[PDB]
């Protein structure tokens, strides 16, 4: 019956390349482009035409003909030339784009036309494999081996290290379940080492509640209807509640901060530092919620299952705006842009700075009444948290590297950290350099 899925997996594996090989291929085709000395290709035009083409939902053969025309119209010799070289402003190749959108028919046509699967394409594919669209295409469930967080992602996502494991696994894209668990542990560990910090007792309690009630497996919540009933009830009772939120191939940040226990008003804190947000809006947005009853079980079920149910960014975003009465946010926290990552750590963690802001606003009686020193206090506690999380992960990395001094991944993670964070606290650098020295010991 479903041999198309088997065929696509075969193709994806035949077309696999290491990143450096794929970069060579691309660079060599750039040299050939310069020999011909024809006009420069227009990637933005290609993707515009590509996205229009995909929405027509054409059958394979017509699709492939149209794909040839728009490649040429965009300045490429062929569909294959465009497929191997074009990237959009998010840095996605066409194949990455089709997989991120869970458009497996288009992804397979791209493969038929010679598109290559580097480590990033394969990671985005594995994420897209855990979705209703993947099941309906005939794919099986992911093997349970892939449930564990790869060490290159555990350290890579927390510490911000871009690298690839020796086995091909990039540090960038992660499933929701193990990354939400890692956030829940990081927040809880901080809360426990700082019992006088009342804010973080609330935050740890909220993550623990949502982490358990959502019961993600890979990137699909496992008790969809009930979980949203639980979270909505917690919000209705006026308790700080986090809301795991995703769309196709992307995770955002979302939480509800109550005015007080049993209150009906509070704030909805939304974070997106990456795909789908304009660079000017990268960061965290705080909406005033006058009546929490608009944060319904259905809304929350839609938020948590956004990726598995194939919701688009605009569908999720519009529901978030609806729950806030389509009013504009009252505050924006600008936060560093991210690209080529589904932000399972980035958006969840940066959302906490918005939670802390709202906790301060609550206690001084409103956003009206925040002073400059209040908001510098907020930023100071947020940075105290992210410092704690960073220091523990560097110590964990040094420890791991000394107990397995010959592992290529631990060594390369350690080296790449120092290379990519030159301005790192000297105590962090010291800890990792001494670990690297120790490792070179046979």
Numbering used by the authors: 19 to 460
Which text from the study accompanies this structure?
A Legionella effector LegA15, also known as AnkD, is one of 11 ankyrin repeat–containing effectors in L. pneumophila. The Dot/Icm effector LegA15, a 471–amino acid protein encoded by gene lpg2456 of L. pneumophila Philadelphia, harbors an ankyrin repeat (ANK) domain that is known to mediate protein-protein interactions in eukaryotic cells. LegA15 is a GTPase with a unique catalytic mechanism, unlike any eukaryotic small GTPases. Here, we show that an ankyrin repeat containing effector LegA15 localizes directly in host lipid droplets (LDs), leading to Golgi apparatus fragmentation of the host cells by hijacking the host vesicular transport factor p115.
